[PDB]
């Protein structure tokens, strides 16, 4: 008769398969909030101790990090933490790294040849770019990506880079969107998630898209990692702990990938042979410890008008 509240800012379809799986494993019903990360976030903040929520899942890393420093959430069991690399869990242990996703530049080949694609994200304010491709300005993992880049090259040439975005990309409310008008021959290109390709080739069975890695440690290639963390306010931190500690089994994995074209995070499990090698990604050196809460990238964001 216990009931958990998830508040999921993953994808819809991937939080109801991992809540669904978890409930025909051990009878506990999850009762789903769907929302976006930051969203969420901010009404955990407010809820604070009186929020229903006990488990939170997220697309990406920095809505954690900002609640794991205001202390809303729960140290993690030994076991769980035990099932991922470190440097994808919370530092203090108290949020864990369930799927990573990484960024991509979905292309059509009709309308573009692979050789002739921006060698390096940075290249992309360049004019002779303009009206070529879409970027998605709201997105939690585009937030990622300004972060990277004004890690990897600096606040000033972070600024410089996403003047140029402003100027010449065209804005995308979602990564749907973005990956439907690649497909639809809109827009020659667009910077997005890997997995949404994934999701656009099960629909409608081929595409004319292709995905292209910038890899060589290219700002770019950015590894970013969906997690998960329990409410310290949960009045059932027994069966919320539990419900973390499936998402990382092998059969929650499995359930979340059966959605989402991700990247285990439990140790020793490999990712579906269709997706780009993880080991072939050549991501920046950079961890969601390193992105942080991703502040400075929110402010270049908002001063540049995105
Ligand atoms: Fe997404």
């Not at 304010?125 to 300004?146: C, I, N, Y």
């Not at 600096?154 to 975005?165: I, V, Y």
């Not at 502040?295 to 001063?303: C, K, T």
């Amino acid at each position: 008769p216990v009931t958990l509240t998830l508040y999921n800012g993953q994808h819809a379809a991937t939080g109801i398969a991992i809540a669904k799986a978890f409930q025909d494993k051990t009878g506990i019903q999850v009762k789903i909030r769907k929302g976006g990360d930051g969203q969420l976030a901010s009404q955990i903040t407010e809820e604070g101790a009186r929020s229903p929520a006990d488990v939170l899942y997220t697309e990406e890393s920095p809505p954690l990090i900002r609640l794991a420093s205001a202390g809303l959430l729960a140290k993690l069991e030994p076991e769980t933490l035990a099932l991922v690399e470190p440097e994808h869990a919370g530092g203090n242990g108290d949020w864990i790294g369930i799927t990573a996703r990484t960024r991509v530049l979905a292309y059509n080949p009709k309308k573009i040849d692979e050789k002739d694609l921006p060698k390096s994200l940075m290249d992309l304010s360049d004019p002779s770019w303009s009206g070529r491709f879409g970027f998605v300005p709201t997105s939690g993992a585009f937030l990622e990506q300004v972060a990277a880049v004004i890690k990897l090259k600096g606040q000033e040439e972070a600024e410089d880079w996403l003047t140029g975005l402003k100027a010449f990309g065209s804005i995308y409310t979602n990564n749907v969107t973005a990956m439907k008008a690649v497909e639809n021959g809109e827009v020659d290109m667009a910077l997005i998630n890997n997995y949404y390709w994934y999701t656009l080739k099960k629909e409608k069975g081929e595409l004319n898209s292709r995905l292209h890695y910038f890899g060589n440690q290219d700002p770019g290639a950015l590894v970013t990692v969906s997690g998960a963390a329990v409410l310290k306010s949960s009045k059932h931190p027994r069966e919320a702990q539990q419900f973390v500690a499936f998402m990382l089994s092998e059969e929650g994995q499995k359930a979340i990938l059966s959605q989402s074209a991700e990247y285990p995070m439990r140790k020793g499990m490999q990712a579906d042979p269709a997706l780009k090698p993880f080991a072939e990604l050549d991501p920046p050196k950079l961890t969601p410890a390193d992105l942080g809460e991703a502040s400075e990238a929110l402010s270049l964001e908002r001063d540049v008008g995105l």
